[PDB]
């Protein structure tokens, strides 16, 4: 595009002179050194250009060059095990140049333009290729990385290149129209990737946490929301989920959050295991970092870049798992942008978009069948940390009723050493009804009724606990003390998972089913005893209590035998006394 | 306690309502000032 | 030289100068009148037809005929050095003192260049202040932003001066070269009156804590642009010292409410349409621009730790200033009006205080073993006592139990021996000894949070 | 200009027991008396103008009432200043500017008053400025801004309010002028909030710059309990540099008595909370004793009628005497309550009414009245 | 439009159901507030009553013809406020209202409907 | 124009017990029925219309759903005027401008109603105007003002609402017309906050 | 406000402002005991709190309510003293003992 000169310089706003042809919302690099901005207005022969950087020290008369492309990312091989800023800038290669700071106007490419890969063709000349199909393959350390065709392209192949070693700048296929397809392509972050059709929830997202996966599930297209107080052990929950989920790749997005995830993940999980290969977990992670003193455009593009990269890894055929952190901090950034644009606010100050941009981020998630006859999924678990902690502000009021499951991390439960701390009286999920058939066909046939019976047990234990502490847990009729002791058994040996153990971090579905079965059997036999008139002290002094107390700490190989023996022994030893 | 919470909610709603009127009048004043100074080259 | 005449407008703070497209946005100019007296300025909104200037102090005596504007600097810079370690500056950065102006080694720009989220590390070690509360219950590890939420009448200047005189770092516990880690403090005060200025000067030059401090004073009736520039100069000098000569720095910013009010005033005079509750929309970014220049990096040995002292305006925690400040920083400390009126100094409310990075700075190899457990137990016992005091007032000492009697006496002795300390300098060992003596007043088996291997050697 | 500004170390005696014993002001200081209409932001300033310890007085009225300014021109050349015996109108330079005169003369009058006071300070006396209703200044600025057609900050006040107020409050203080003497300009500027709320820009910007701050309350002014100084919203910052002067010129444990009085008040407040929750009969005996001692204090030591003949100028020794009596009574009553006597008898002890009416005495027979009442208390509270 | 066509021209008996009128009101506030038109009450513009009445009143029963149109607009009170602008305007336009309950839903009753605040 | 304005000394019997015993209204006076939604304002006004003791009745409606107008239209012609014995709709001049119809027609309808009532007073009868949703009228005023692009008052409404309402309500009172014979115009204006 | 100069000794009667102050204090006490009642109950009241309550009610019933009759300063002061006599002596710390003895 033709260049242009500056006219006015007022704060971060710059007005270009001589741009009759520049489009809206384009990255343009204003100044002598490059200060990439964004064209937000057009009036006759000028353009308002919102700059990201300081803007101090510019003069009127310096050139302004346009680009023509609206804020794209570079999707290709090389993104695994990388750290990126909000606009996909590699932080390590930046540190290699500027020292320890972040100077103004650095230019660096996201994908390394100097590494060599092992290309293996998958087509032949004279063949028919359209959007979304496969051209080849190249192994990126850990698993095989495909090379898709840029969507909305087609033609007839004319020439491929023989297998060997080539970089990301050797045109690897050439069509009939003369177009050159390389190993990567760009995709504007504000436009979702297309598919064939969106499927429906019929498969659970097996986390590894018993509470979640049993009582409050979420399909493998879901959208959960997890608030967090200051000192409720949320980081460890998120790390355990990213470690033992059933996803293939994990993407993490943080706009305002610490620079301790870096050290923590990158030095703990590597020296520890990725529990399928033993190598570092950072070989399936695309971590994205943003502190508080970075530009607002960077924060917004951070959220959208995260979700677009996840959509790409889905379109390759995998199953991705996103973890958006501090959607509230994102909303703060958005409100600042708005108040800069001189816009009439709404209740609490947020613009009248907070409900549309949010719903445009949470609606890019769902199981889908890609453009090449495959399967994919993207599941989002976005934290919502209010400034005070009240679920009535606009951010939370919209996130609820946009999301499915909801996981109420609490701090008092953490103070009572109950880890993980998820308040079952406040959480809730909506993916139970439409997921029951998978349960019947893959776990057992009474799994729904066992789950509902356990939920009723907990409900009654709480409703009783309402007034227990008044007169102490000793002056109640035997049925009440039985209910209370059974509730204690439930919430102290089934609803609690020491995430640091060796063989107790991943309770399988069958294992959870067995534990629920044993607890309900013990309750049935204890009520059968009390109904006859045995004391309420032998019940608690039996050895089956300890036997089921050590249930979860056992391994996943001896559990069927342990379960059979435990049920036999309970049913036996609950008649002799 | 719920009566006090209701009172607080009402007062808070009124106080926030009486800021958007101010922002609106300020934006109109800015528009008028721009329209006037766009004609004050000399005279 | 003396160019750029031909101004065409003067009103309040502003001054429109006619054709001048050679001045860079954000520059610094001077305005020589028709009588000799000069002034300051700052270019903004430069365009091809005019260039709005904003004078610093005042504009009484300027006319459209005899007035000229001249350049000084394209940006705002500061001439830093190591010789400025016994001096006393003001605002812009000229000495309000008798000593001669020093010579600089590099003239840094006063802002910009945020740290890199992959070039940091995790703060571990601890700093000792002398105040026993901020030591045994609200520890202050290096590289942390720990604000102090003062009040309207409560003593904030005195606590600030006490911390500045007492606070040192203890390398005796880790194990390293003693004369290897120097310590400095860069006290910077915005909007002080005339009493507080002399109070601060005497409070420093009495003990002699001037030999390692650098003061930036901003007496209240100075212009607002200087009150905007002050924390930038302070933090520039601080992180230069630290990340260039391996110092250990401690920055204290006084009354951030005055900074916020000056910021809102400047915005209004620049026609910004305030964002929310009269304050500008960019105030979160503006605050996070200075609450964030302090940390620890990997590869260096220095550090920068901040203690912004602010004052909740109407005794409120939902005002935008304390809201955003708690949103950006990690911790808080609450002065207590009740303890003030009852006559306790330093008045620190220990229930609503907190320190997020405390568990990373206490333990074997740093201070001691029983640190965190002692803190937990003291918190629990004090809350118990403070509840049963009102209970007693309503019911009577007639229907109590022995444990409640003992908890009441413990709470009273804690308020009268552990908080009330005056002008003492309690080391960490002395504070822990007092804490264990105070905890002894309870029977064992009530210490439901300490380990027996600790109860044995102490108590 | 001056040579250098000294540090204030001597009080500004004004007659009122609250504003002298509890919330003092040094002889270089500043203050602010904000409150809604119907509190006495004018009665208190007139009393400071007719019963102070200064040499000269300048009374600036910036938007006051014509009657409020003519009741000074008529009465002051009849009273006798308490330092020389002459008329009181031989030390007053009052500067009237009422509410229907032109509108820029408001700020004009403020600056005129301050410059006259600084002239007298450079001369060598001890002036005492008194600016009334600085809020009228702010509203004048608001009107001039609305004529300039500019961009206003919160509530219309132009975006240079606080600068003017700070520059005006920062030319007050003890100083050693260019002739090698000493002077002083004390300022007491009233403030009128538009609804009584201390969140107006003027009511907030006038904090953070001042010394004492005497917040007036409306309910105390409905009960006809004057002066209506709220005893827990006010504060003072000078009460720690004046203790040497108190020890030198009043007593030796006067700081300790002041501390005991303040502690008793602002501990009784907490008990009053539970009182309003439950009721003042489910409390113990010591608690009801604390409540009743608090009420005796509140009605016999913090109340003052500016229209009595001798209860309109209470000096330091008289205030210290009353405090001593109250403290001794409380001590002996605590001992007796420990013994077991009943609080109703403790209250019916007529030393109650004695130490109550002990404030309508003159200042000549007090040194004997106080001794007699002190010995009578010490006797009668061990008789029983 | 389709409903009125089928009813008053082919003699059907339609039954229109509009879910989430709250999302409609949000869309309306957002599309309006981009033209600077004096936001009326807590965001939403002044003519929200005019618009809701523009789309509600299209349901009636005409003489001579034998069709009908019947509406059941489901809406969710934003924060259980019955004094929110959306429920207030809707209650002022329509006739009779059926109010779901929240306490009955906790005890496990379905469809949770408290017949105390509802009428036709 | 009239000769002179008398003072009302005769009750306006509406039929309802509260409003004829506790809080009565003289037969020249004014009134107001504010209240939230779903409380009975429409039923109360229609009951006044069908059982009052006025000669004629002029029902104005500006913003009320058309089902009410159809109710009165298809109900009245089979009732009986309880003064003579003819159909009830032979003493009603109801004016209809529902919610979906244009806006400014609201204020046009208010003024047409009051002028018809003034005429029927000038003939020597005693009429009883019953307006409806003066709040809706004020909304129409606000819309027209914001189109004119003038500065608003408290909560959007233009700063002459009070003057307009005062004139409208002050055109109501017992009077002795230019023919010598007396007359009266009651007014019952609903409001809906 | 302009009352302390237009009333007092030599103009209306030498005991006007004192009866004013005392009536204000007593009525404020009665109004506070109203809320005390509304919290506790009328039978759990001290023996003099009931006196203050009944003074407040008599004040609202005889001193304020006056129909359309033309009183006089002396008739109204006689009514005020009648009311103030309903409280005991010695509990009126505002009036002087001389007036206290002369009128009751
Ligand atoms: N120290 C005092 N003693 C007795 N009465 C007072 C005192 N101060 C104020 N008042 C009463 O309070 C009223 C306050 O008057 P004024 O000062 O004009 O109003 P404001 O206090 O609102 O400025 C006066 O009418 C006076 O009767």
Numbering used by the authors:
A (entry chain B): 1 to 577
B (entry chain G): 169 to 211
C (entry chain D): 5 to 463
D (entry chain A): 194 to 577
E (entry chain E): 240 to 359
F (entry chain C): 194 to 386
G (entry chain F): 360 to 463
Quoted from the paper:
The V/A-ATPase from a thermophilic bacterium, Thermus thermophilus (Tth V/A-ATPase) is a rotary ATPase that has been well characterized using both structure and single molecular observation studies. The Tth V1 moiety is composed of four subunits with a stoichiometry of A3B3D1F1 and it is responsible for ATP synthesis or hydrolysis. The Tth Vo moiety, responsible for proton translocation across the membrane, contains a central rotor complex (d1c12) and stator apparatus made up of the a subunit and two EG peripheral stalks (a1E2G2). In the holo Tth V/A-ATPase, pmf drives rotation of the d1c12 rotor complex relative to the surrounding stator, resulting in rotation of the entire central rotor complex (D1F1d1c12) and inducing sequential conformation changes in the A3B3 catalytic hexamer to produce three ATP molecules from ADP and inorganic phosphates per one rotation.
We reconstructed the 3D structure of the holo complex rotational state 1 using 71,196 polished single particle images. The final structure of the state one has an overall resolution of 3.6 Å. After subtracting the EM density of the membrane embedded domain from the density of the whole complex, we obtained a focused density map of A3B3D1F1d1 with two EG peripheral stalks and the soluble arm domain of the a subunit (asol) at 3.5 Å resolution. This map allowed us to build an atomic model of A3B3D1F1 (V1). The secondary ADP in the semi-closed site shows a lower occupancy due to low affinity of the semi-closed site for the nucleotide and partial flexibility of the complex. Upon dissociation from Vo, the isolated V1 moiety displays only ATP hydrolysis activity accompanied by rotation of the DF shaft.
